[PDB]
């Protein structure tokens, strides 16, 4: 709305590697996340196809399409409730203390639903899981929601 | 301030005071930095060092400025004294979680956030509290050795 | 452990000493509804993750920024130098020093 | 340029300047090469070294000529710093295909063709990205060790 945030246009100049002021359709998922929006990858996929837009063939972009797609994704930020994120992992391990065994969270984050690479899974556990093999998800989900 | 530490500051004062008159001026600062390899040392860095004093940098003004910045400076033998009391059986570097708990639970200076900053350049072993001794080195003489 | 994943009704089944028990066709119906309900619940929980996942990649990419350059340029030098008289000289000589 | 690296270039300047007057002329180049075993050093090689300078080779002209050729020169401790961040678990030499993918996909300086030239005298292990450390040695001091 501007509140006209012109820093979204300045961040589009940091993600366009050619400097022509266009951003390919394959970068739009990760740049919506870097502007403070977390649409799921199936949602980013649907919307695209919904609009008869094929992410399979070469794509370019213009700021005039990327701005309204970020504004259509911005209504879905009401789905980011931290009660359900901590209660999900609290149902994932027994006893009254928030600890996932290391390999349980790593294999679930790579193979269940939207596949996260094991390189990204190791980069998200690095520091929050110590050598006991127990990830405290009270501080883990706190630090994941700090970015 | 022990007397050998004051003699070390007298030797550093003589190496920066290349005119040997007893007062380090801005030309001495620039010519000591140029003799260490700093060809691009700006005049604003020399002016910020002189702006920390109220007068000319003679030996007692340099000692009082270093005294007021190093009000908790501890020599390596007293830091290893305290770490030998924390590891009273000798040889072993003490655990990471033991130093985090004992810093917090004894004193407010050992609060956590500060403990994350301790681990942050004082690497793992040092941070963790396992090694020992390298941290005493870098507290008496900074930067990576 | 397997049934851990899937946007499936964790109701509709039941385990026991030699086997699992499973519904069809009602309980079968239940689950299905359930299944959709996790895509929601799930699909949404996936996203953030996905999102977040890459959000850490940027923090790394960025850190890396210079360490590369350092590496980048640094090599190039050598490729140029290693063939230079003066540099070979310094090389054989670099040792006699102290 | 760190100060110990500048002191290494001052020691190399004194070993090539055998007249000890502060300027390396063509006779110093020829007599340093003859003392290393080069009895057949041509005058055209000495003239090509002097043709890289605009004036006489004093200590600051030798430092500026080496600065302009070594604009990406990195000491062995900072190259091992970056390789310890690429192998953050320690000890292991990193895979050949991991260094080829990460050089290309991050930067244009890590493009392939250049990666074939990296494998080409930096042997297999080095090229592959498995060993480590020998490449830091030969980047700070060339030729096979």
Swiss-Prot record, chain A:
Keywords recorded for this protein, A-Z: Motor protein, Muscle protein, Myosin, Repeat
Superkingdom classification of source: Eukaryota
PROSITE patterns: EF_HAND_2
Signal peptide: none
Gene Ontology CC annotations of this record: contractile muscle fiber; myosin II complex
Domain EF-hand: 7-38, 41-76, 80-115, 115-147
Processing and modification events after translation: The N-terminus is blocked.
Single GO term (MF): calcium ion binding
Subunit structure: Myosin is a hexamer of 2 heavy chains and 4 light chains.
The protein's name in its UniProt record: Myosin light chain 3, skeletal muscle isoform
Highest classification ranks of the organism: Eukaryota, Metazoa, Chordata, Craniata, Vertebrata
Swiss-Prot record, chains B, D:
Post-translational changes noted in the entry: The N-terminus is blocked. N,N,N-trimethylalanine, found in other myosin light chains would not have been detected in the N-terminal tryptic peptide in PubMed:7358336 because it would remain trimethylated and ninhydrin negative after hydrolysis.
Cellular component per GO, a single term: cytoplasm
Effect of residue 83 to L: Results in 50% reduction in actin filament velocity
Record-annotated EF-hand domain positions: 9-39, 74-109, 110-144
One GO molecular-function entry: calcium ion binding
List of residues binding Ca(2+): 17, 19, 21, 28
Tagged with keyword Coiled coil: no
GO biological process, one term: skeletal muscle tissue development
Transmembrane segments: none
Record keywords, A-Z: Calcium, Metal-binding, Methylation, Motor protein, Muscle protein, Myosin, Phosphoprotein, Repeat
Keyword Calcium: yes
Subunit text: Myosin is a hexamer of 2 heavy chains and 4 light chains.
Additional remark text: This chain binds calcium.
Stated role: Myosin regulatory subunit that plays an essential to maintain muscle integrity during early development. Plays a role in muscle contraction.
Protein name: Myosin regulatory light chain 11
Highest classification ranks of the organism: Eukaryota, Metazoa, Chordata, Craniata, Vertebrata
Gene name of the encoded protein: MYL11
Residue numbers of the full-length protein present here: 29 to 164 of 168
Swiss-Prot record, chain C:
Localization terms from the record: Cytoplasm, Myofibril
IQ domain span: 38-67
Annotated region (Actin-binding), positions in chain: 14-28
Record region (Hinge): 93-95
Modification sites for Pros-methylhistidine: 10
Comment on protein domains: The rodlike tail sequence is highly repetitive, showing cycles of a 28-residue repeat pattern composed of 4 heptapeptides, characteristic for alpha-helical coiled coils.
Family indicated by similarity: Belongs to the TRAFAC class myosin-kinesin ATPase superfamily. Myosin family.
Function: Muscle contraction. Myosin is a protein that binds to F-actin and has ATPase activity that is activated by F-actin.
Subunit-level organization: Muscle myosin is a hexameric protein that consists of 2 heavy chain subunits (MHC), 2 alkali light chain subunits (MLC) and 2 regulatory light chain subunits (MLC-2).
Protein name: Myosin heavy chain, skeletal muscle, adult
Organism: Gallus gallus (Chicken)
């Amino acid at each position: 709305s501007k509140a006209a945030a012109d820093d979204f246009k300045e961040a589009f100049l940091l993600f366009d590697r050619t400097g022509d002021a266009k951003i390919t359709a394959s970068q739009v998922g990760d740049i919506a996340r870097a502007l403070g929006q977390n649409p799921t990858n199936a949602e980013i996929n649907k919307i695209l196809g919904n609009p008869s837009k094929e992410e399979m063939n070469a794509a370019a972009i213009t700021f005039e399409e990327f701005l309204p797609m970020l504004q259509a994704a911005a209504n879905n930020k009401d789905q980011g409730t931290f009660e359900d994120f901590v209660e999900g992992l609290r149902v994932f391990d027994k006893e009254g203390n928030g600890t996932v065994m290391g390999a349980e969270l790593r294999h679930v984050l790579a193979t269940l639903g939207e596949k996260m690479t094991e390189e990204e899974v190791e980069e998200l556990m690095k520091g929050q899981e110590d050598s006991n093999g127990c990830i405290n998800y009270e501080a883990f989900v706190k630090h994941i929601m700090s970015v | 301030f022990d007397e050998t530490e004051i003699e070390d500051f007298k030797e550093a004062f003589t190496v920066i005071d290349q005119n040997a008159d007893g007062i380090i001026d801005k030309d001495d600062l620039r010519e000591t930095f140029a003799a260490m390899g700093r060809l691009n040392v700006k005049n604003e860095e020399l002016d910020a060092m002189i702006k920390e004093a109220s007068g000319p940098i003679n030996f007692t003004v340099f000692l009082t400025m270093f005294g007021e910045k190093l009000k908790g400076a501890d020599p390596e033998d007293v830091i290893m004294g305290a770490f030998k009391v924390l590891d009273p059986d000798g040889k072993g570097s003490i655990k990471k979680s033991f130093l985090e708990e004992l810093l917090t639970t004894g004193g407010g200076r050992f609060t956590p956030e500060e403990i994350k900053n301790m681990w942050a350049a004082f690497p793992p072993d040092v941070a963790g509290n396992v090694d020992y001794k390298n941290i005493c080195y870098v507290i008496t003489h900074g930067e990576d050795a | 452990k397997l049934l851990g994943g899937g946007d499936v009704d964790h109701t509709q089944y039941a385990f026991g000493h030699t086997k699992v028990f499973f519904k069809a066709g009602l309980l079968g119906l239940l689950e299905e509804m359930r299944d959709d309900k996790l895509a929601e619940i799930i699909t949404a929980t996936q996203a953030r993750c996905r999102g977040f996942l890459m959000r850490v990649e940027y923090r790394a990419m960025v850190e890396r920024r210079e360490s590369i350059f350092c590496i980048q340029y640094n090599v190039r030098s050598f490729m140029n130098v290693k063939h230079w008289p003066w540099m070979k000289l310094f090389f054989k000589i670099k040792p006699l020093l102290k």
